[PDB]
């Protein structure tokens, strides 16, 4: 799902 | 069918062996040694830039935006941080998002960002300095299931099981026939234990590296060793390598072979990018990120740990290493230690190149002015590899740094000795047994025109002849009694006239205690490195309490510190008073015959800092006066933010005016001096002549 990958972008940026 | 009975009864013995280790003491966990715990309050004298270095020294990271704990961001007049969780002794605490806001040279507010409400006080987690060496050589840091991030668990399971088999291997087995034993004992515990507990024991047991002759194993201790941050705050790129090193710890080591270890992280990032958990949108970001710490560490802080190790069995007994999961809370200050280590690393070659010296060494010791808590300790010129600790082991002559003890003894007699009492300054010749006459000389080999100087100026200028005339008028046991009250070793005191001008061999930590007793206003505080010692179950083993023992009168100590402010402004230490006048620093210089040893005892509002500069073979340093030891202290004052010494005069202190002839005046005068009096009407007794 896209709810897992989107959270990881703002966590690693 | 007898084989079914043998394997069934064997499984009960395996089940009994697993239950014995897992239900009780699993491993002999070594003692974690933490630094100081800094509380923050409104109107606290700390700047924004001073807080940045405190945070970076406590393993925090300056970032654009905060995501995981142990991170912060700087603004024009504020810092936003996520205070990491830490099981403190007074209360357990979680993550806390807060803004520290500054006005000028003070912390105005501390506001929780989740509720937009102030904090009366805010705790800062202590830095984990090191682990105490174990006999077996299996160094670990226990972290329960709650402490590991869920992405690190997903990265592990994706590359191993993907629903434990290698947990049983490293538990009780060694190095084809016993693979069936590994398979039987794995299924026995997997069924008789929780799904969460199997990840907890595995993540603390796995081998990830080596540090000399001790095995660093488990994700928590490995994270701090390889990256300088806990397991909770690992970035997915750092998690991939730490998970990747589980199969080849030694072969994928970044110190021995960086190129080989770099390929493993990208390989593990592909195993998770191919699966659901990650996509190609961020592979370019994580594949570019290189791995941070430089060459690991075998023994961090060897000098300070000597005092911690000495104090541990001296307070709790050697019956302590047997206990597992001990928590040692020390008084260590990372800001001051980092400031002192640079001042010693940079300051030594700066003196060797300027004065053309072959070798030169140093030792610095910082302690709390009121509590005597040891904040920092440098015991060498290069603390990269330090076997010898000069701050504790090198016992040298204190020299002129012995002069304040004589003036303290004098100024404790208000009714006879004051700051305006005259001391003679003319040729001296003191006869002694065996054998020649002792004729002491000033550094100048000069005497005063009037044949006298007032007490205050003799200490300010470190005048040898008047110190002998004063010291011998009081008597050598009266001066030696003050050294005992100041907290120095009694076995090192030899009460002869040489003692008055520095015939006294002390180490920097013993000098630290003497000046600390003065710094507090005559209250001896036994120097300590430990704050508390806690067990694995939260029960306290040792806990410090205040031990401020009234050594000398507060008024005597005050006038001696007031005179030590004149030493640094206009006297022997005039160099430092011109650099840092706003601190109003109190201190004393130390020089021996032929400058074999040089010193400086520097007191600020918050601490006492003793610094020694000399050679290991007891030879002339070829350095002018105490400028060698003062330049190292200047570098320490420069490297961190000192606290201004604004002395608060105790009761019975009267600022009195004296004429050129050194007598008190009723109205007016031409030199103001603090003087220990309840009724300042001595002026009447002087003016009726
Ligand atoms: O059947 C196998 C059993 O085979 P094992 O050899 O027991 O386990 C390894 O091999 C498995 C396999 N062939 O299938 C494996 C690939 O699945 C295992 O990998 C995983 N996923 O676990 C693999 O296990 C790991 O193997 C590491 C090294 O294995 C060796 O790798 C070589 C190259 O591939 C082979 O030639 C060897 O045959 C093989 O034995 C284990 O780490 C080692 O553990 C030792 C204790 C380390 O010794 C230390 O070295 C230090 C040092 O370097 N200096 C110090 O001297 C220190 O005193 C000393 O204790 C040592 O440095 C360290 N070596 C490496 C490369 O990391 C390490 O402890 C161990 N980790 C776990 C969780 O089990 C199975 O059950 O899978």
Author numbering:
A (entry chain B): 79 to 91
B (entry chain A): 74 to 236, 269 to 280, 284 to 399, 402 to 799
From the paper:
PBP1b has a modular structure, composed of an N-terminal tail and a transmembrane anchor followed by the GTase and TPase catalytic domains separated by the regulatory UB2H domain. PBP1a is mainly involved in cell elongation in partnership with PBP2, whereas PBP1b exhibits a preference for cell division in agreement with its enrichment at midcell during cell constriction. In Escherichia coli, septal PG synthesis and cell constriction rely on the accumulation of FtsN at the division site. Here, we show that EFtsN binds specifically to the major PG synthase PBP1b and is sufficient to stimulate its biosynthetic glycosyltransferase (GTase) activity.
Having strong evidence of the binding of EFtsN to PBP1b, we performed co-crystallization assays between PBP1b (positions 58–804), in both the presence and the absence of moenomycin A, which helps in the crystallization of PBP1b, and purified EFtsN (Leu75–Gln93) peptide to identify the binding site of this domain on PBP1b. Crystals, which were only obtained in the presence of moenomycin A, belong to the space group P21212, similar to those of previously reported for PBP1b structures. The structure was solved to 2.4 Å resolution by molecular replacement and showed an additional electron density between the GTase and the UB2H domains. An attempt at shifting the sequence in both directions on the helix did not lead to improved Rfree or electron density. This 13-amino acid helix mostly interacts with the GTase domain and runs approximately parallel to its last α12 helix. Three hydrogen bonds are observed with PBP1b, between the side chain of Trp83 and the main-chain carbonyl of Gln384 (α11α12 loop, GTase domain), between the main-chain carbonyl of Leu89 and side-chain hydroxyl of Thr140 (α1β2 loop, UB2H domain), and between the Glu90 side chain and the Arg141 side chain (α1β2 loop, UB2H), as well as the Leu344 main chain (α9α10 loop, GTase). The GTase domain accounts for most of the interaction with EFtsN, but two residues (Thr140 and Arg141) in the α1β2 loop of the UB2H domain pointing toward the GTase domain are also involved in the binding. Furthermore, the structure reveals that the conserved residues Trp83, Tyr85, and Leu89 of EFtsN, which were shown to be important for the in vivo function of the protein, together with Ile86 and Glu90 are directly involved in the interaction with PBP1b. The binding site of EFtsN is distinct from that of LpoB, which binds the exposed surface of UB2H domain. In the structure of the PBP1b–EFtsN complex, the GTase domain is also characterized by overall poorer electron densities compared with the rest of the protein as well as, compared with the GTase domains of other structures available.
